[PDB]
Structures are given as C-alpha cells and as structure tokens.
C-alpha cells in the first residue's frame, strides 16, 4: 500500500511512468516503480486522502553513514 520515494494500453502505461518520473524531478529525486505510478495518480485538488499522500523520503547518506 505505502509508497516511498528514492534516495540521493501499454502506450498509456508508458505515459504514466513518464508522469511518475516527472514527480520525482519535483518530489526531490527518484521513487519506486510501483509507488511512482501511484504518485502519478494523485490530484492536486482532491481534498480527500490520496495514497500518494503516504511516503517515506529516502536519503542514501543517512542510510549508509547514518548521519547527515
């Protein structure tokens, strides 16, 4: 269910993927495939709780060294 970005009919599917890529550019950097797609779906206007609304920001550095 939960999405999470990333560290530091087919034709439409491809379009969706491109769209996800576009968000990471905006969201910071990268994002998991599956999530990214969900990230694609989110509507800036639906006041209701979207799922792209759920995510953990991942940052290599802290992950590897453990400290910024």
């Amino acid at each position: 269910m939960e999405q999470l970005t990333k560290n530091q009919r087919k034709k439409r599917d491809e379009i969706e993927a491109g769209k996800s890529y576009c968000s990471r550019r905006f969201g910071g950097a990268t994002c998991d495939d599956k999530s990214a797609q969900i990230y694609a779906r989110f509507d800036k206007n639906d006041w209701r709780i979207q799922p792209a609304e759920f995510y953990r920001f991942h940052d290599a550095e802290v992950n590897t060294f453990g400290y910024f």
């Binding site: 910071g28 006041w47 709780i49 609304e53 940052d59 400290y67």
Partner: protein, 426 residues
C-alpha cells in the same frame, strides 16, 4: 460510525514567512507547525540564504541542507499521551520543560522564549530526537538533557553541532571496531567445532552492528514484520540540499580598486509534497549550513606516512581484503597533527579518498573558510564543527553568520468547524 470521514475536509492556510539567522555548523529549526491526526500537510518554502559581508572575495561555497521531519506526540509524552487523548476534557495537561530566561535561548526551536521560560515538552524532545537520530555521529552518545536549562548559550541560541562532511579524517570507522577477536583455548588443542561457532559469532556480530540495530531490523531479519515504534525515530519527510553561491562586489575608489567583497545570495525552494499526518504531532523543518571541510594542512596519507610498504602501495585487494582496520593517527594526514590521537581506517581507505588541497600561500591569510590548523580533541570533538572557526571570514557577525528570508507557503487539509458556532454558539 465515522465511515465517510476519510474524505471531506477543508484546506487551511498556515503559510507564513520567517526572517532567520544561524551559526554555521549548528542544526537550527526554522519553522514548526502543529498537525493533527487526520491532517494533510503541504509546504513550499521559498526565499534566499546568505552569508555576511565577507572580508575577501568569493572563494569556497557552503552547502545548505533543509530538513523537514515528522515527530508524533506519541513519541514524546508517550503513553502519558495515550491516556491524555483517551481522557480528553478530563486529562491532566501535557508537561512543560524549562528554559533559561533569555529572549534568544529557546532560539533553537524557532521560538522566542515565552515570558515564563516554559516550552511544551514536544517542541524540545522532538528536536533532541531528531538530533540524536540523524545528525549526531552514531558512534557518539545520545544527547540527553532534561530541559533547555542545561544547554549553554551557544547550543541554545544557535543550533546544536553537527559533523563535517564525510572525509577520511572526519568520519572514521567507529572507534571501537574490533581489531581482532580472540577465542579461549586449551594450551595444546583447539576445538575445531568451537572455532566454527566462534566464526559464526563474528559474522553475525559484525553485520548486526553495521547492518542491524533497530528492533525492526532484527525481527525483520527473521522474515517477520513489525510495527514496534518505541525507537521514537522521527519521520524524515523531505530533505533538500543546495550549494549557496553569490557574486563578488567590485571595489571602485582610489584606495581599493583591486579590492572586493563577496556577497552570497542564494535563492532556494524547499517543498514537501502533500504528506498525510497519522497522529497529532509536530513538523520540524530545520536548516544546516556547512562549508566543506577543506583544510590548509591536510596531507595525502601516502605522502605523509613516510617509508612506503607493499601493503600501503601495492594496493593488493587480497591483503586489504582480509586485513583488519589500521590505526592511522592525525599526524599521518595533517601537517602538524597530534600523533597522540589515532583513529581507525579501513585498510585500503587511502586509495579511495583524495583530500582537497590548499597551497600554503593562503595558509596564513585572513578571510578563507578553509580549516586552518587541524582539529585536536577526540574523534568526537574533532569530528564535530567549531563554529567560531569561521567568524574570521566575515566583516561582521552582527546578524550571526548566515541569515535568510523565506516564505513558508504551507497549506493543510484539516478539519475544524467554521467560524460558525465556532463563533455562532447556537
């Protein structure tokens, strides 16, 4: 039944701007907004960052980092909190924590010390958790104060202190990484069987130290999953880093033609994409400016260590392969380091790093943010940053080192009644 609930809410505008300043090397919070279980929090930070008039020209640049963490109250008043939310109108107020009686002394939490020197625990504990969980060297010890009282001006007026950018002398192996491992034995016979079990132990220990730590990690290493939350590890929601540069200001009057002063004026945007708040809590979003740790006396470990030996130059993978950490010593990498202080390096480490280099000419000049003489204390004190060290490169620290104006464009889809009933009783 709640049922629909997960839907119809309005968007409120907790946007606001802020004018701030900080010390270089200290994690300072810039703005903190409360969020309630249910809220959907959206932020778009924009503005500019700057250093103070510089005495000389532009030379090296600072890297600015702007973090935005999520700290649920259940991690701070914990439990105490459960009962509270459970008791509602009847529960006993959430505790406070005290602050030394100085305007700027609750300053690290981006608030002017209220007239009573009282600050809701969360606002403080929160920070500490963030500090203790993402900024302090993990080999370092948890930072455990009670109430700000305990912090010294510097700490409480400016941010705590974080470490230098990762570097072969600033972020070594943990100071207690085993340099060997022994296994008791009979004076005349090893128990093959034990020796195995012995090795088995090494491996697991090893991993479990680097790769493993938090409870989850273990439970998970079994294949199970778990929600255990106690670690209180805060939620990193978003980090953004930028390098901050400006332009030099050309001198233009008799005395000073060939003269110049560098002005730093970076513009930046830091945005948190709509993040759903699960329990009531706090959203800290702190800043941290650092000059890259370039020093004037660092040396190529290979060029300084002296008499060169096959393991040090051959660069033979097998050796570095299974050869435990070496014990370099500051004198081996600094022009005048204290051989008394030693740190642990990963055998091949020298062929994996390249120190920056500052020709002696600048060495004794005034106004370059290079690290002048090499650190001295221990692998903590050495690792952390002495902000005074930079005062030297500024025409004036009247407004501290780095100040910055920014509008915190923050909307939050939450639910509070209208000003109707909320103001219209009947």
């Amino acid at each position: 039944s709640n049922i629909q609930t997960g839907a119809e809410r309005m968007p409120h505008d907790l946007s606001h701007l802020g004018f701030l300043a900080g010390q270089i090397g200290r994690l300072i919070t810039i703005s903190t907004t409360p969020v309630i279980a249910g809220d959907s929090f959206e932020m778009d930070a924009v503005g500019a960052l700057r250093l103070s008039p510089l005495r000389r020209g532009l030379a090296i640049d600072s890297t600015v980092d702007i973090f935005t963490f999520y700290v649920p109250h259940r991690h701070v008043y914990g439990e105490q909190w459960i009962k509270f939310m459970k008791d509602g109108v009847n529960a006993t107020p959430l505790p406070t924590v005290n602050t030394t009686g100085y305007i700027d002394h609750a300053a690290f939490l981006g608030t002017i010390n209220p007239d009573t020197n009282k600050i809701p625990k969360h606002l403080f504990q929160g920070y500490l958790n963030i500090y203790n969980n993402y900024f302090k060297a993990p080999w370092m010890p948890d930072r455990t104060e009670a109430n700000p009282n305990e912090l010294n001006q510097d700490d409480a007026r400016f941010g705590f202190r974080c470490c230098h950018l990762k570097n072969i002398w600033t972020a070594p192996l943990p100071p207690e990484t085993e340099l060997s491992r022994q296994m008791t034995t009979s004076t005349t016979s090893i128990d093959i069987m034990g020796l195995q079990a012995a090795y088995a132990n090494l491996h697991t220990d090893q991993e479990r130290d680097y790769f493993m730590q938090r409870y989850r990690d273990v439970i998970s290493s079994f294949g199970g999953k778990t929600s255990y939350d106690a670690d209180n590890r805060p939620l990193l929601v978003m980090r953004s880093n930028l390098w901050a540069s400006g332009y030099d200001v050309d001198g233009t009057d008799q005395t000073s033609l060939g003269q110049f002063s560098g002005r730093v004026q970076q513009t930046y945007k830091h945005s948190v994409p709509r993040f759903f708040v699960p329990e009531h809590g706090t959203m800290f979003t702190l800043a941290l400016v650092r000059f890259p740790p370039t020093a004037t006396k660092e040396i190529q470990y290979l060029n300084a260590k002296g008499a060169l030996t096959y393991t040090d130059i051959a660069g033979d993978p097998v050796l570095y392969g299974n050869l435990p950490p070496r014990e370099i010593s500051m004198k081996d990498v600094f022009r005048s380091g204290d051989s008394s202080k030693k740190f642990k390096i990963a055998e091949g480490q020298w062929y994996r790093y390249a120190p920056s280099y500052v020709s002696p000419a600048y060495h004794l000049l005034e106004g370059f943010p290079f690290i002048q003489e090499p650190p001295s204390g221990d692998l903590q004190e050495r690792v952390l940053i002495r902000h005074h060290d930079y005062d030297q490169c500024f025409q004036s620290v009247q407004l501290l080192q780095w100040n910055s104006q920014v509008k915190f464009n923050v909307t939050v889809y939450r639910n509070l009644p209208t000003t109707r009933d909320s103001i219209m009783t009947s």
